[PDB]
Write a protein that binds this ligand. Structure first.
Ligand SMILES: Nc1nc2c(ncn2[C@@H]2O[C@H](COP(=O)(O)OP(=O)(O)O)[C@@H](O)[C@H]2O)c(=O)[nH]1
Ligand SMILES: Nc1nc2c(ncn2[C@@H]2O[C@H](COP(=O)(O)OP(=O)(O)O)[C@@H](O)[C@H]2O)c(=O)[nH]1
Lengths: 163, 165
């Protein structure tokens, strides 16, 4: 079993907490408090890769916390909301921050969350894909609400990590 | 440069959480008044860069550990209070330190306050047990008196110095 630390980043309300709860606990409850209720949570994927997952919900404003959150992190997911263009712009700022401040070996994924609300889409799939490709990022659209692509994002990260 | 943070107070009922908050925020103490800060939260600052605290009291809510998600969400600091005249309160402070370490952001700054230190002629919690305990858990520690204001401002100052700039 390989075990790694993974951090979730992104604007408040994009779905960071929901994504971690869906992956770790299997479930979703709408309008819950925006937190994972735990200092960190753990879950695995079999190829076995075990993730210790740190959420930044409630802490998004505090970029000087970066040293602590990124120390010993092997992976990160930057999350945006596909219905909110500003959150995609914001995601780029965190991708940049990871690139400048996290370990040079960190595996970064971008998640376009709330893809169940594709009718209210404001960030084009092809736009985020090009951006992800330009930055050597993993990219998927996700829905914590339905579970669409949630486990599979963590699996894609697991495959990119060292053995 | 005003950094503003959220701070939560934990500890057994009657240790002095509400008194400590009112002393820092309003400057004053009134003995035997209701165990509440009379506000959803209160704000006060410390100048170093000015650090502003939005302070949540748990007085009246101590039983309900299931509220922790809401209280700890977006919190950057916490103070766990005990009463230096009451050993069970110190034993209890350890339970809340453990709850914060398990359930709050890993980045949270945690302080330990031995309150009612003005009643040193009724002391039952050894300062050295408390200090050793604080050291083992990477906590800030001071004894305080909401009643006289001894060390109350300086406790929040010490927390402010440890928080991110
Ligand atoms: N429709 C939809 N709502 C979601 C999704 N993920 C999260 N939410 C909701 O969006 C709000 C914010 O989610 P939350 O996980 O707390 O975001 P966080 O602040 O980034 O941790 C809550 O009401 C969630 O239930 C999703 O994939 N689809
Ligand atoms: N002697 C003394 N009494 C205090 C001190 N702090 C609080 N008290 C008193 O202890 C009682 C409980 O305090 P309170 O602040 O309501 O505790 P809380 O339930 O933790 O909010 C009240 O009668 C306070 O006036 C202190 O530093 N010294």
């Amino acid at each position: 079993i390989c075990q790694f630390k993974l951090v979730l980043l992104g604007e408040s309300a994009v779905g960071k907490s929901s994504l971690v709860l869906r992956f770790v606990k299997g479930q979703f409850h709408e309008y819950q408090e925006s937190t994972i209720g735990a200092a960190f949570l753990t879950q695995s994927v079999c190829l076995t890769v075990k993730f210790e997952i740190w959420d930044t919900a409630g802490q998004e404003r505090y970029h000087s916390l970066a040293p602590m959150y990124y120390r010993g992190a092997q992976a990160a997911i930057v999350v945006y909301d596909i219905t909110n263009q500003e959150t995609f712009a914001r995601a780029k700022t965190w991708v940049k921050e990871l690139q400048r401040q996290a370990s040079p070996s960190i595996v970064i994924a971008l998640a376009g969350n709330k893809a169940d609300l594709a009718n209210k889409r404001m960030v084009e799939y092809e736009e985020a894909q090009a951006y992800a490709d330009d930055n050597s990022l993993l990219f998927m659209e996700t829905s914590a609400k339905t579970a669409m692509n949630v486990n599979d994002l963590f699996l894609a990260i697991a495959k990119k990590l060292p053995k």
